[PDB]
Amino acid sequence: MLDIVLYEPEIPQNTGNIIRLCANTGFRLHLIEPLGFTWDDKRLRRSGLDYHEFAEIKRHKTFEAFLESEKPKRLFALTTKGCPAHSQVKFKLGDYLMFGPETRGIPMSILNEMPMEQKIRIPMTANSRSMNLSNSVAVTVYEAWRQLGYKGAVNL
Amino acid sequence: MLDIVLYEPEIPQNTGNIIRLCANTGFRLHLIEPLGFTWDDKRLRRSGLDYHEFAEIKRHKTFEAFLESEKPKRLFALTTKGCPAHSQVKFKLGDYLMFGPETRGIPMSILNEMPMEQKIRIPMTANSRSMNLSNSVAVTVYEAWRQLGYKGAVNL
Ligand SMILES: Nc1ncnc2c1ncn2[C@@H]1O[C@H](CSCC[C@H](N)C(=O)O)[C@@H](O)[C@H]1O
Ligand SMILES: Nc1ncnc2c1ncn2[C@@H]1O[C@H](CSCC[C@H](N)C(=O)O)[C@@H](O)[C@H]1O
C-alpha cells in the first residue's frame, strides 16, 4: 500500500528478504544507487526469489532523481536518531518509508533537511545499536499495514 | 517482556538475528531441540553477536520438557494456518510466542491441541507462502511490545 525506499543498500541477502517482504505485503520497493551488489547478482536469484517478485522494483540513480520522479507526498526516514517511534505516527496513503545502509544509516545531509516528525525510530532497549535491516523493514511495513487495515491480505 | 520460543530452528543466521532481536527488546528466548546447528556454531559467533546477547537463552531438549519447566500461562503458535492476525490478539504478560522451523512450520500434532484463538497468522497477500523466520519473529515481537507500551525502551 505504501512505498519502501532503500538508500544505497549494501548486502544482497537483506535486499532479498525485503523484496520477498514487499511481494508478501503489496508494498512497492525503490532502491537508490549505488547498491553494494550487481542487480544481476546471484544473492537475490539463487536466493530462492521468484522473478515475479522483481520488476515492480524501481531503481533510482541518485536521491535527487528519486525525489524528482516520485515527488513523495510525505517521506519518512527510519533512523535510530528519530524521536517519535514508528508506531506513534499515523501513516497515510502516499507515504514513502526510507531506510539507510546496513553499515551507516541515512546521511545526516539528508536527515538535516527533514522535519523532526518524519524521522522515526523503532524502540530498542539500553545499549542496543540498531537492528538488522531486513528486520527493520519488516517491522515498519507491518506496522504501517496494520494501521491501514491490511488491505490486500488474503487468508490461505 | 514476553518469552519467544523457536521450535527446532534450523538455520543459524536466522537464530542469530533472533538473539539480537531479543536482546534489543528485552524478550526472553527459548530454543526447542533438536536444532539444525551446534550451539557452539560459528554462524552465531563470528556472526557479529556479542556473548552477552546469549546465556539468557534457554534450551529445551523436547517440547514436553519445555511445557513442564515453563508452564506457559498462554502459548501462542505463529502459523500461516492461523485465523486471527498477530495484531488482532491482546498480548499479556505471561504469554509465550512459538514459531516453527524454516522449512516446515509447527507440527500439526502440536497445533491440533491448541485453541483456535491462540494459532495466529501474520497477514500476507495472495499466493504468498510465508515470510523469513527472523522477519516473522521481529514483526511479532514488535507488535506485542507495541501493545505492552514498549516497557524498557530507551532513547539513544
Ligand atoms: N531502531 C531502529 N529504528 C529505526 N530504524 C532502524 C533501527 N535499526 C535499524 N534501522 C534501519 O536499518 C537501517 C540499517 S541499520 C544501519 C546501522 C546504523 N546506522 C548504525 O549506525 O549502527 C538504518 O539505516 C535504519 O533505516
Ligand atoms: N504469515 C505468517 N504468519 C505466521 N507465522 C509465520 C508467517 N510466515 C512465517 N511464519 C513463522 O515463521 C516460521 C518459519 S517459516 C516456515 C515455512 C512454512 N511452514 C511453510 O510451510 O511454507 C513459521 O513456522 C511461523 O512460525
Curated annotation (Swiss-Prot), chains A, B:
GO terms for molecular function: identical protein binding; RNA binding; tRNA (5-carboxymethylaminomethyluridine(34)-2'-O)-methyltransferase activity; tRNA (cytidine(34)-2'-O)-methyltransferase activity. It catalyses: cytidine(34) in tRNA + S-adenosyl-L-methionine = 2'-O-methylcytidine(34) in tRNA + S-adenosyl-L-homocysteine + H(+); 5-carboxymethylaminomethyluridine(34) in tRNA(Leu) + S-adenosyl-L-methionine = 5-carboxymethylaminomethyl-2'-O-methyluridine(34) in tRNA(Leu) + S-adenosyl-L-homocysteine + H(+). S-adenosyl-L-methionine binds at residues 78, 100, 122, 130. Keywords: Cytoplasm, Methyltransferase, S-adenosyl-L-methionine, Transferase, tRNA processing. One of its GO terms (cellular component) is cytoplasm. GO terms for biological process: wobble position cytosine ribose methylation; wobble position uridine ribose methylation. Its EC number is 2.1.1.207. It is found in: Cytoplasm. It holds the Pfam family SpoU_methylase. Methylates the ribose at the nucleotide 34 wobble position in the two leucyl isoacceptors tRNA(Leu)(CmAA) and tRNA(Leu)(cmnm5UmAA). Catalyzes the methyl transfer from S-adenosyl-L-methionine to the 2'-OH of the wobble nucleotide. Homodimer. Belongs to the class IV-like SAM-binding methyltransferase superfamily. RNA methyltransferase TrmH family. TrmL subfamily. PANTHER family: TRNA (CYTIDINE(34)-2'-O)-METHYLTRANSFERASE. This is tRNA (cytidine(34)-2'-O)-methyltransferase. It comes from Haemophilus influenzae (strain ATCC 51907 / DSM 11121 / KW20 / Rd).
